[PDB]
Design a protein around this ligand. Structure first.
Ligand code: PLX
Lengths: 69, 57
């Protein structure tokens, strides 16, 4: 029965090791992403949560019929 | 926010052109032909400095 239907314990052991490594890395990445989201939304100094401002290319830099703009 | 610098009244005194608008208009073309250089200098100062206190002379 063992020879026909089942493998040795090492296969399940090392597959468990691989699964545990993947899951632990995913958990750490989730916590890191939450912290990064919090910091980026608080400071606004990252790529995320960038809200539009007025384009400076819309300004007319011409004499304006009055010396003081 | 700091105080505003202003010229003294004595600095603002100058001989005045006291002819009416009709007199100025009647001579406008020749006046612009003859006195062009100081007027253009004043206008360039006015549009570059953007401050009336820097183009008094
Ligand atoms: C001989 C008498 C004394 C001993 C009697 C012992 C009784 C045992 C027989 C009863 C069957 C046990 C249940 C079967 C469960 C096994 C299913 C699965 O886990 O096994 C697969 C094996 O597949 C087998 O083909 C299972 C086939 C069993 C299906 C039972 C069908 C019986 C139906 C009855 C039909 C009779 C005639 C019908 C007339 C209409 C594994 O696939 P594999 O990916 O390789 O695994 C790798 C492991 N290796 C490396 C060791 C190979």
């Amino acid at each position: 029965i063992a020879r026909t239907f089942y493998d040795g314990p090492e296969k399940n052991y090392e597959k468990t090791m691989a699964i545990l490594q993947i899951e632990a890395e995913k958990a750490e990445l989730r916590l890191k992403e939450l912290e990064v989201r919090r910091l980026m939304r608080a400071r606004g100094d990252g790529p995320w949560y960038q809200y539009p401002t007025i384009d400076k290319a819309l300004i007319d830099h011409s004499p304006k019929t009055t010396p003081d703009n | 926010p700091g105080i505003v610098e202003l010229p003294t009244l004595e600095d603002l005194k100058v001989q005045e052109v006291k002819v009416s608008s009709s007199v100025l208009k009647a001579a406008a073309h020749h006046y612009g032909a003859q006195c062009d250089k100081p007027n253009k200098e004043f206008m360039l100062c006015r549009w570059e400095e953007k401050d009336p206190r820097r183009c008094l002379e």
